[PDB]
Structure formats: C-alpha cells, structure tokens
C-alpha cells in the first residue's frame, strides 16, 4: 500500500511549475498522477512550491482541523496552488476538469515521524 505521506506527495505536489499556464493543466495532471484511474476524483488541489516548503508548514500555525482534531497547520504565507474540479459535464472515463490557479494559504494535517503533511484540510 502507498504510505500516507507518499500519497499526499503524489496527489498534491507539483513543484515542477510555478503556476498552471493552461486551462488543460488539470486534465493532464489528474491523468499523470493516476487520479482518473478507476474513477474521476472530483476535487484535487496541486501546490506549486518546493516539497521542503510544504513540509515546513507542519511547524507553522497550529489550527484546528475541520474535523476537530488539532494536528492541522496553516501556512504563514500564501502559496501558488491550482485547484482541479470536475465540470458538471464530466463522466468517467471521460474525465474533464476546470483549472483554477490562485495564491492562498494552505491548511494541512500532519502526522508521523518525521512529521509531515498527510492530508489537505483547506486553502484560504
């Protein structure tokens, strides 16, 4: 099985680009990361920062998670992100996504040792 940390990296990290340049970014990335394999994952965001910067959020502002747990952290600064969301049209296996690029703070749940991001909570 994939570890939680590895899964977070595969689904959410894209340090290779500074921002999504095309409206087709999500369609390509969702496919490349194998997120459209058995179904179309409906929502998924990509962070365009280095892995080290994202991991460093686990030592930033501690906040409650939407679930009430307290292992969530919000980034002190805004980061480049791309939100991918399935369009009302979209039908597996013809996955189609809307790409929305933005700069905002991210909120992640961290766990383990080393203590790293394992889940996204939100972005703001």
Catalytic residues: 12, 119
Token pair of 54 as six digits = 């994202």
Q: How far apart are CA 57 and CA 73, in angstroms?
A: 6
User: Interface with Cl ion by CB under 5 A: which range of 43-51, 73-81, 94-102, 103-111?
Assistant: 43-51
Chain centroid offset of residue 26 CA? 12
Q: Is 6 in the site for Cl ion (CB under 5 A)?
A: yes
What's the closest the beta carbon of residue 120 comes to Cl ion, in angstroms? 5
Radius of gyration of the chain (CA): 14
Near Cl ion in 93-122, by CB under 5 A: 120
Instruction: Using CB under 5 A, pick the residue from 34, 70, 77, 103 that binds Cl ion.
Output: 34
Token pair of 80 as six digits = 């480049």
Q: Is 5 in the site for Cl ion (CB under 5 A)?
A: yes
- Torsion angles phi and psi, residue 16, rounded to 5: -75, -20
Applying CB under 5 A, the residues found at the interface with Cl ion are 3, 5-6, 34, 44-45, 120
């Amino acid at each position: 099985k994939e570890t939680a940390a590895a899964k977070f990296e595969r689904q959410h990290m894209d340090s290779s680009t500074s921002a999504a340049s095309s409206s087709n970014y999500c369609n390509q990335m969702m496919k490349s990361r194998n997120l459209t394999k058995d179904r179309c994952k409906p929502v998924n965001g990509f962070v365009h920062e280095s892995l080290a910067d994202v991991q460093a959020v686990c030592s930033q502002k501690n906040v409650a998670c939407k679930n009430g747990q307290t292992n969530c952290y919000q980034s002190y600064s805004t980061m480049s992100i791309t939100d991918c969301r399935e369009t009302g049209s979209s039908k597996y296996p013809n996955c189609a996504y809307k790409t929305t690029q933005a700069n905002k703070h991210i909120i992640v749940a961290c766990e383990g040792n080393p203590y790293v991001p394992v889940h996204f909570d939100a972005s703001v």
